[PDB]
Structure 1
Amino acid sequence: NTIPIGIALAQTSNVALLGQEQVAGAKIAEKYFNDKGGVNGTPIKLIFQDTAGDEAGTINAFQTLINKDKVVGIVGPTLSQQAFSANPIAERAKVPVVGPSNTAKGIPEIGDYVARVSAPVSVVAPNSVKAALKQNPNIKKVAVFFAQNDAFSKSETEIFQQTVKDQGLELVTVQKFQTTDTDFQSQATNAINLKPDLVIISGLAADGGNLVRQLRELGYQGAIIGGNGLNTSNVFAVCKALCDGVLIAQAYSPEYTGEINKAFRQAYVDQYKKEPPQFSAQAFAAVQVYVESLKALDTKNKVSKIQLPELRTELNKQLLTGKYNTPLGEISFTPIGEVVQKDFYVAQIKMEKDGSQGKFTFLK
């Protein structure tokens, strides 16, 4: 007998360029927590249902997890674009959802059953602009690009644009693209003709990486910031050596000295031979929230004796009150499910000259 927790992430489609890291983090959490006895001796069982890359797939995944798999709660989905469409299904059904990577404005406000462990664009993104200005105090002109079909990208670009304004910089253009585009020659050239000193990109991984590469090919030599959708080594394959120097804000640091991070990092590094990415740590934290909440609930109200609808409602109520020492640091929730998290960072892509290997270097 086990306690089923649903994992609804993009395991297929180009969105899996981000989802792959989350699956890895979730599996690490499953072993970590089950090795400690699961929920007071009862193991958890992660049940994975692929959302693919769109809203319909996420709705189907959620409905399958809720109705067929009988899960006590869901971790997911990968994208805010998917969450805005699918989370209301879980809200209506009174099934908790914890978002591992949904950073758009308005996610926790979807309802009383929606929380997130992923710090939002408003708190994460401005730091990368400040980092760019530290490395080059003479930045004056900024070109901004965003994916106009993606909810997160639209939310993120608004924060980047406001930050540019607040730092006293000139916004020379805002260019739009679609996440499904591969060619950005017209937008890139339009921007390059305005002689920007800094370029900011809000997109996802494949699109973001292709845009970075094309900007460099077209002769752009200035600074580049990528938003959260570019925050994966899976962009290295796409831009290769031309990824070098891209700044991306982080809501996680491998070097964070919390005991559970040391354990998580060690487990990740031993397996994957590189530092754990943000998305992996955030997915781990989402699973942790469920395990620790299930433990606290079970101690007060033995879960094996609670029928599923009440179990879900009590689990939701419990998780919102909890304090968690996670790889992300000490986190908690506001009464509407917003994450409370103190520390943020900025990392910079460092490519080896041959372009076949790279890493994220954290700025001090």
Structure 2
Amino acid sequence: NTIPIGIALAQTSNVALLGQEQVAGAKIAEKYFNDKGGVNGTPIKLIFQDTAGDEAGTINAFQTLINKDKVVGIVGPTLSQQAFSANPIAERAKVPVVGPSNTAKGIPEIGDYVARVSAPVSVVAPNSVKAALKQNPNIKKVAVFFAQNDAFSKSETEIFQQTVKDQGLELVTVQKFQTTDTDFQSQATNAINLKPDLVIISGLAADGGNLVRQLRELGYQGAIIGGDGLNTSNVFAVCKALCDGVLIAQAYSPEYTGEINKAFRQAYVDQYKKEPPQFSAQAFAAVQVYVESLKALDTKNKVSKIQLPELRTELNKQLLTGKYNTPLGEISFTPIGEVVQKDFYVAQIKMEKDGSQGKFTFLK
């Protein structure tokens, strides 16, 4: 006998360039928590249903997990874009959802069954602008790019634009693209002609990486900030040596000294031979929230005896009240499921000259 927890993440499509890191973190969590006896001796079982890259696939995944797999709760989906369309399905069904990495404004407000462990763009994004200004105090002109078809990219760009204004900088252009675009020559040239000192990009991984590369090819020599959708070593293959120097805010640090982070980090490094990425840590934290909430609930009200609809509702109620020492730090939730947490960082992509390898270097 095991307790089923659904994992609805992008395991296929270009969205999997983000989702696969989340999957990795979830699998590390499953082993970590089951090796500690699961839920008071009862193992958890993570049930993976691929969402693919769109809304319909996410709705399908959620419905399968809820109806066929009888899960007590869902971790997912990967994108804010998917969450806005699919999370209402879980809300209506009274099945908890914990989002690992979805940072658009408005997600916890979807309903009483929607929580997230990832602080939103309003507190994440400004960090990287401040870091850019620290590295070059003479930045004056800023060009902003965003993926107009993606909910998170639109939410993130709003924050970047406001931060640029609040820092007293000149916003010389805002250029739009689609996450499915590979070619950005016109937008990149448009921006380059305005002589920006800083370029900010809010897209996802393949698109963001291609845009970074093309900006450099077209002769742009200024600073570049990537938003959260570029926050993966999967961009390295796309921009190669030309990824070097990109600044990306972080909501997780491998060097955070919490005991569970040490365990998580060591498990990750030993397997993948590099530091755990943010998305992996976030997915681990989401699974942790479910395991620790299930343990707390089970101690007060034995879960093996609770029928599924009531188990889902009681689990949701419990998780919202919990305090968790996770790889992300100590976190908890507001009454509507927003994360309460502290500490952000900024990292900078450092590529080897040949462009075949790189790393994220955390700024001190």
For the superposition of Structure 1 and Structure 2, which TM-score range results when normalised by the shorter chain? over 0.9
**Local SS of the residue matching 1:149:** coil
Counterpart-to-counterpart distance in 2, 1:63 and 1:56: 11
- Does 1:131 find its partner at 2:131? yes
1:344 corresponds to which residue? 344
C-alpha separation in 1, matches of 2:343 and 2:317? 26
Q: In the aligned structure 2, how far is the partner of 1:50 from the partner of 1:120?
A: 24
TM-score normalised by structure 1 residue count? 1.00
| 1:347 shift after superposition | 0.2
Residues 40-83 of structure 1, C-alpha deviation per residue, up to 9 Å, x if partnerless?
Answer: 00000000000000000000000000000000000000000000
Give the Cα–Cα distance (whole angstroms) in 2 for the partners of residues 120 and 99 of structure 1. Answer: 11
SS in 1 for 2:149: coil
**Matched residue, 2:279:** 279
Deviation at 1:295, TM superposition (A): 0.1
Deviation sequence 1:199-234 (CA, Å, 0-9, x none)? 000000000000000000000000000000000000
Name the TM-score, length of structure 2 as normaliser: 1.00
Q: How far apart are the structure 2 equivalents of 1:232 and 1:32? A: 23
SS in 2 for 1:50: coil
1:188 aligns with 188
Cα distance, 1:168 vs structure 2: 0.2
Per-residue CA deviations over 1:312-341 (Å, capped at 9, x if unaligned) read 000000000000000000000000000011
How far apart, CA to CA, are the structure 2 residues paired with 1:50 and 1:116? 19
Q: How far does residue 163 in structure 1 lie from its aligned partner after superposition?
A: 0.1
Structure 2 Cα separation of the partners of residues 176 and 63 of structure 1: 34
The CA distance in 2 between the partners of 1:341 and 1:230, in whole Å, is 23
CA–CA distance in 1 between the matches of 2:308 and 2:84?
Answer: 25
- The 2-side partners of 1:254 and 1:323 are apart by 21
Query: Which runs of structure 2 are paired with 1:183-262 in the superposition (5 Å)?
Result: 183-262=183-262
Task: Give the number of equivalent residue pairs.
Answer: 364
Distance 2:123 2:50 in 1: 29
Whole-angstrom distance in 2 between the partners of 1:231 and 1:44 = 29
Note the 1:1-364 alignment, pairs <5 A.
Answer: 1-364=1-364
How far does residue 247 in structure 1 lie from its aligned partner after superposition?
Answer: 0.1
Segments of 4+ moved more than 2 angstroms? none
> Structure 1: 5+ residue runs without aligned partners?
none
Deviations 1:124-177 (A, max 9, x none): 000000000000000000000000000000000000000000000000000000
Q: Secondary structure at the match of 1:183?
A: coil
CA distance in 1, matches of 2:345, 2:352: 22
Distance 1:220 1:313 in 2: 53
Q: Tell me, what secondary structure is at the counterpart of 1:263?
A: helix
Q: CA deviation at 1:100?
A: 0.5
User: Aligned partners of 1:288 and 1:122: how far apart in 2?
Assistant: 25
Q: Secondary structure at the match of 2:219?
A: coil
Q: Percent identity?
A: 100
CA distance in 1, matches of 2:342, 2:149: 31
Q: CA deviation at 1:119?
A: 1.2
Deviations 1:255-302 (A, max 9, x none): 000000000000000000000000000000000000000000000000
After superposition, the C-alpha distances for 1:8-29 in whole angstroms (9 at most, x for unaligned) are 0000000000001000000000
Give 5+ residue unaligned stretches, structure 2.
none
Once the two structures are superposed, residues 88-126 of structure 1 have per-residue CA deviations (whole angstroms, 9 ceiling, x without a partner) of 000000000000111000000000000000111000000
Does the residue aligned with 1:347 lie in a helix, a strand or coil? strand
